[PDB]
Design an enzyme around this catalytic site. Structure first.
Site, short mmCIF file in Angstrom:
data_model
loop_
_atom_site.label_atom_id
_atom_site.label_comp_id
_atom_site.label_asym_id
_atom_site.label_seq_id
_atom_site.Cartn_x
_atom_site.Cartn_y
_atom_site.Cartn_z
N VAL A 43 0.56 -1.13 -0.05
CA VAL A 43 0.00 -0.21 0.04
C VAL A 43 1.05 1.20 0.11
O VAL A 43 1.95 1.44 0.59
CB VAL A 43 -0.81 -0.16 1.29
CG1 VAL A 43 -1.30 1.16 1.88
CG2 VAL A 43 -2.19 -0.79 0.95
N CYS A 44 0.32 2.41 -0.54
CA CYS A 44 0.96 3.57 -0.63
C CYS A 44 1.18 4.40 0.65
O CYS A 44 0.11 4.57 1.36
CB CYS A 44 0.05 4.61 -1.65
SG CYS A 44 0.32 3.88 -3.40
N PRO A 45 2.33 4.85 1.13
CA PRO A 45 2.68 5.17 2.33
C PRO A 45 2.47 6.73 2.51
O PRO A 45 3.10 7.27 3.50
CB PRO A 45 4.26 4.86 2.30
CG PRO A 45 4.65 4.16 1.39
CD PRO A 45 3.62 4.46 0.22
#
Lengths: 166, 167, 168, 168, 166, 169, 168, 167, 167, 164, 168, 168
Positions: free
Chosen positions: F45-47
């Site tokens: 997932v995008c941090p």
């Protein structure tokens, strides 16, 4: 049960020490490391190599502030007779370690290594530090023997971490 | 365990003729059985009671009676004690069975276990051919009892079984 | 978790050969299994025990023994630790499975969870092809154990199931 | 209730003592050894040799500081009548030992020798030390008599042990 | 009264021998059942003796007589075998029943539990096992055998002629 | 945890400026706190939510507001994730604290723990200088959230405390 | 009312295009729904949040998303407020539904009712086409809510529910 | 109402020498009391028992014993029965008290009330000077009850209570 | 009990025409019944009321009404009292039934028992042919009650049954 | 609540002369009180009763009697309704209190709450200077009460405490 | 239950109707409106204006399908004696409405108008509709007289609303 | 519950018509005097009132022996007065020399055990009460039947006679 990081259950009984009967207890070992190990029975047809190897190497434990005590549910009279049987007849011969009697079976029960069916101990080993805290425990199924060198190694490594961290 | 009741059932490993054998109360059906208890193998009490029963076993065998000695020690201690010569506090050759009560249940069932020390009082039981207790006695740990009195009791019970009481 | 009793069932996601695989005690039915626990990924402790096990894994396979390592970290952490090269305190590649215990329930059933901090003691279990625990040992958090002594024990249990008498 | 190494159960009852009625209790024996023995019934068809043998040898017990009392569930009136029936006639003749009546059956009950069904005691014998602790008990089925000499031997042997332990 | 006599069973001395008797041996007859405290006491035994002396008078009106104490049957027999001139009973024409377990005296409400012996209770029981009369005395007073006989006759009379006055 | 409730007390080890530090709710008295939960370190997932908070950290500081991110990962996990460069999927330098909730109790106390898998929902809490929760927000999916809007909310709460709720009319 | 769970069922009277219509949760099956609560009609707080949602109603419509506003006022009050021109503190025309929660049970079911004063907190729920709550937020105070951030939220849910959770 | 126990306390109205008088158990402290129950005044049963006791009343006085007859009838029935001449089934003159137990509580307390029909069995009790029951008897039916034998018992208790059990 | 409710059940032994008869409330189905209680037979009160009822018994029969007198005395006292000639305080022959309430249950159920002394209050009940209580009266122990009024009440009830009661 | 008993307690925000005011039963001690309920503000039913009471309010003040109208609407609706031209379904100026029962506890305690729809029945209560309910009446439908009759009832009670 | 919108509680009793005793119940009034009103007592020193006024107006009620019944705790015998007392002499004279007796007081209790202390009814009035639903209720304290004109206005108004609901 | 003979009369307080006016009277007013308290079902019945009228005519005869007569029914005191004011020829009472007590609450009939709960009216019960309030005599008839005043008077004299004399 006993469990690592926890104070060891108190024990008191009659032991054979230097061919004498002497009462001993967890408190006697205050300030020293203790290796407490259990075995099933005196006089069996199993080779006493584990008890004899600890006796042979006891001086290595003594030189790192560590004592060794063997325990089984036999009486202290059995232990003394086993000790006075020559090694070539199944016997132990001279012992450099105390053989503690657990005739009432409460010690093996408190240490969680009693097989209630047959009324004897599993092969349990406990390393207890100078404050009565259990640092290591291991338990083997009745038949298999364990390494003295490895126990010594552990005792030393606990000492090393005491003095120098991780 | 009370006089006139069936003897509590027992099963265990014994040393019989230098070998390990499973024995039980049912092995004695049709026979009289003298079951006696002692505290421990290898003590500093000379085993004269056990040895006296062993030396006289054939007097029991001739009156259809077996003799079994019991302690809380293991069957291995039993064998080592037999294999220790008399001059060294051993038993030497035994003509009777040495029964192991390692779990202590047999001693408990016969009302002779001292729970604190975890060993048995010196109790003796004469059990008849149907497994009923005819006589029990129990002594405090130190005192040895009489083999010749036991044999007399056994024979007295057989006499009554065959003749009666009237005189 | 006592010797002579059946190992408690477990199931979880592991990093097996760089993939995520759901893994359970049932997968080892018919083999020996060394199941060990360690406290945490990415610590400032030498992970020497974990590496030593991966290096000698072939030798456990050669005696029909699998080795599974387990901690309370996510499987994402395990992967990220594997992908960290050993020159930087990572694991580099791993020949043994790293089981994630995120719910802490596997450490709980094996009796090695410290509830206060929420991590496992250094516990080790040798489990036989019937799922029966033959050996267990637990060390306090800092001290590493010996892989060769573990292998020795697995061999010695196998020798006994075939002869049972290491003594004339 | 009564077991070796325990304090004997308290008793009190009416006894025939030298042809006279006296109220006796366990307390009357403090400082002395006591052989307390039960028998089933006065006036039976079974020659009372056990009771006679004890009375004949009462001197030997008296010499080693040991009293002897016999008990049955009969009344003290049956006891006296039996003592007054001549030995020639199935009586006891005179008696050198106390004959205690357990008319209420509670003494037998407390000593664990009462058969509740017929309401009479088994042939039980107890050796009680100066502190009232039971050292020896034995119990026989109703028909068979025991040996007075063996009972004397036992009393002397418990005395020997308080004086010298045992180490062979 | 107007109530059934409790069932009893026991060993009696009957014509110098031991017989097992019960209430049922007395169906179809009148039974006088009396209790006394103990054999061989110093109390004068003249009640038991009078009942024995006059037993035939009771038989003639279809009535049996049974004396009971908590003594054993052996005591009963020994007391019967002691000459009257010595405080014994001599020959006995009535049954002496043993209540060794004390349950008969208990069932009949005459047992003094503390000393464990029966009071002097007398019951007249009819052919159907119903109690027609009871009497109990505190003390070694003796009761009249003639008056017992009168009551048995009087119960029989009433059952045959009713109780209306002439 | 609902609104006008005091925020549940919490305590734990956090990475602060590349170093481990023990922190708790007590440390934020007299400050605004933005406390937000995310499921796990090192995922696919995008941090970016964490990064945007770190970039804009000074803007929350200028309005007397602190930002703390939390997950069930250990503090060692958090640091390794920080020492993992951004191009490589890590966080790199962090201007906000990363609090470890290894025991899971903080997530549970804030009502955001998913007990089944043992990790936190993406919840955000704005807590005022008295430790009172003024705002809560929860997302069931790796949807993001505007850091700009969180700053707007924080400023608005300060505005209403200072000026009240009456419309200029 | 918890993220991951099914939105509690509701039903009641709303003002829609100047008219009374019964609407319920089932009317929004297959669509997205922003459901949001405010305390009261006709207060001295700017209704900018309600007006803003109305102004960009068709941007929600274009992504298959409906917007319903709810407070515990009656629908008669809602209608009156819609009929008050904006310069006077009213709503003017509304492109979104205004639901009446006169019994307060709708707020109670969504966990936004303050029983004591008897009005709702400012809670907003995003409910997916299956009745699942994907997002919730609650404010203590009229701090406004970005309408554009709610829209972005809606589109991001729609993107993830199709593509999964990975980094494009 | 059991031998060896204290006689239950009683109080009620009796006919004494032709008059109504309240009597109670305490009136009899220091004397022997023969207290007996009968079912009813005026039945077709011969009142032989009551008359016999009345005729030998002075013999009981001679040994410090009183006699009280009781039934569940009123004192009025008692008096009327007394004034009925003996040849008509009356009692005529009575030298013993006739106590009335109208509430039936005396008969309950003495264990002789038949509750269903509400009248007493023929119970007789000898009560000593301290009020202890020495003797009790109970008959079903209107069988006799010897008065010389009741007297002999009273004399016998007196003897033993002073002399003891031995002859 | 209370006017308007069914009379409680009763059964007992009465003296009827000088003989013993079992009677019960059921024996009076289809008839009127005057049931009255009085305290005791053979007292020092003139049995004026009982006798007056007996003198007027046929006047009651003429109107299909029976009369029963009840007290806690036994039926044997009733008979003795009847067979005592009037000049000696007796009743002499009686034209009404004297029912015995020996168990006291009849007075109990009719609500007129004094439990303390164990006798009935002077209560009268008029009971209709279906056993309903139409009238009750209760008086102090010393009182005069009038037969003519009772007879009037009975007739008046019979009146109402036949012709209603509208002025 | 039944006649002859003390009126249940109430407290709430009212519109009094175009301003919000907290008022309670206690504020009316020493005075008579007409408390009446109506379903809802801004309905299509003509606001006939409320306007009539407002028109005749001075006639009530003249006899020591306040009038308070109550519904489950908030006090903000009350204000909005008051500031709506009478010729638009509005109330215009009001000479009586408009009490808000937002929590619905007042309707509940006066036994006029319809729990299902959550609004009050058209109930009216005359309460005396000591807080005792002297008169009550409840209608079902929208149907209108008579202000003249209510004024009559009040005067009649006052006459009674003076004459009988 | 005696509350508006609820079915009226059942009653049965003896009424005086056109000078005769007659038993009537709530059921007799199905299909018709019913004004059911209570007063404290017959023969008071308070003049019977309320009752007479209803009786005078009974036919205006019948025109609109409405029966009128007056009830108090008096017996039907007092009612009839009161009706048989000419108005010129302080009584009721001829009555065009039913006068119901509530001697047991159960009707007044069931209508929540019974004052338990004195044991008489308050002045309550109920307008019950053709299906037995209470449309209007009102209760005054004992002394105060109510208006028949108003009661009639109400009955017509209820009918009006039923025939064509009131919008404006 | 009811009262019986030998017991103290239950206290009563109530409004009675005494000399054509309302008075409050209680049991206490009759201390030191005998009292005939009697119950009847109802005023204004078609059963013409022999019992009540007869007591009024014989009133002075009771006053002569220190005895008051009070009549009671469950009717109001207004009905009592109205009945008194109805001339006898019209089935009224006319002048009364005895108090007519009103038991509107029905408590007094209930306390005297003469109340029939089904119809709510008293049975025809009469009680004679002494100077100390003790019930000497009670008598109850079923509703229709009338009692004799002469007998009641005879009874009062009889009670007085027994307070003065014995029993020959």
């Amino acid at each position: 049960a006993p469990a690592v990081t926890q104070h060891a259950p108190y024990f008191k009984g009659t032991a054979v020490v230097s061919g004498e009967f002497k009462e001993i207890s967890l408190d006697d070992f205050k300030g020293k490391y203790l290796v407490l190990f259990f075995y099933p029975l005196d006089f069996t047809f199993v080779c006493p190599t584990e008890i004899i190897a600890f006796s042979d190497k006891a001086s290595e434990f003594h030189d790192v502030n560590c004592e060794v005590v063997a325990v089984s549910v036999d009486s202290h009279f059995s232990h003394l007779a086993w000790i006075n049987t020559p090694r070539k007849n199944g016997g132990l011969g001279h012992m450099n370690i105390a053989l503690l009697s657990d005739l009432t079976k409460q010690i093996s029960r408190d240490y969680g290594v009693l097989l209630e069916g047959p009324g004897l101990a599993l092969r349990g080993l406990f390393i207890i530090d100078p404050n009565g805290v259990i640092k290591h425990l291991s338990v083997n199924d009745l038949p298999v023997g364990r390494s003295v060198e490895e126990t010594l190694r552990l005792v030393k490594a606990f000492q090393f971490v005491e003095a120098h961290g991780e």
